[PDB]
Design a protein around this ligand. Structure first.
Ligand SMILES: NC(=O)C1=CN([C@@H]2O[C@H](COP(=O)(O)OP(=O)(O)OC[C@H]3O[C@@H](n4cnc5c(N)ncnc54)[C@H](OP(=O)(O)O)[C@@H]3O)[C@@H](O)[C@H]2O)C=CC1
Length: 179
């Protein structure tokens, strides 16, 4: 089984882990408190500290909020070359001078940041997307990473919508707030 990483242990991380297992992946979780977080996950999930989880995969969902990204800054060297999937949303349209994915890319300039899955609810990861809204919008400045995340979306039974460069991340982040 291919191993996919998730940083965080909240509702989104738990729901993502469900879907990843159901679709045939092995999951490693990086948590600040893995002994505590371990009960929030099945025994088949490897719950560990961030620095250990990162050695077990090259593709990591960053299932934390933007305001906590700098808590990972000391991992910069270990994260070099890894795909970081920015799943985040904000509470306001155009909240910051940069999109959350561009902010994450500025913190980890030698990682490969891909925006994706922010439009998917936790409940949708558990039950599946509605048949008329299976779409997940994906973008990145790195074409190869973008295509890997597009393929992961397909394996998770979503319809990936390729919006090209990371410049698209801002309006992808605005979309849940628009109607
Ligand atoms: N909930 C949802 O339905 C959706 C959420 N999202 C996005 O997913 C991401 C997570 O959302 P959600 O699960 O609801 O968020 P939570 O508020 O549950 O936070 C998630 C994780 O953040 C981690 N973390 C929390 N604080 C810190 C910190 N101070 N430093 C380092 N890590 C920290 C915790 O992991 P730990 O304690 O294990 O370290 C925690 O389990 C967000 O970006 C959100 O916008 C996207 C679509 C839907």
């Amino acid at each position: 089984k291919v191993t996919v990483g998730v940083i965080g242990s909240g509702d989104f991380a738990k729901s993502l882990t469900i879907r990843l297992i159901r679709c045939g992946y092995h999951v490693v979780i990086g948590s600040r408190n893995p002994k505590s977080a371990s009960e929030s996950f099945p025994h088949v999930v490897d719950v560990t500290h961030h620095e250990d989880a990162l050695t077990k995969t090259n593709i990591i969902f960053v299932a934390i909020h933007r305001e906590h990204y700098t808590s990972l800054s000391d991992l910069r060297h270990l994260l070099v070359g890894k795909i970081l999937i920015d799943v985040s949303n904000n509470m306001r349209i155009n909240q910051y001078p940069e999109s959350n994915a561009e902010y994450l890319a500025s913190l980890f300039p030698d990682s490969l940041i891909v925006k994706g899955f922010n439009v998917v609810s936790a409940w949708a990861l558990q039950l599946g997307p509605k048949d008329a809204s299976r779409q997940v919008y994906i973008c990145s400045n790195n074409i190869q990473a973008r295509q890997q995340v597009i393929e992961l979306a397909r394996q998770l039974n979503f319809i990936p919508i390729d919006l090209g460069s990371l410049s698209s991340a801002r309006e992808i982040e605005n979309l849940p707030l628009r109607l």
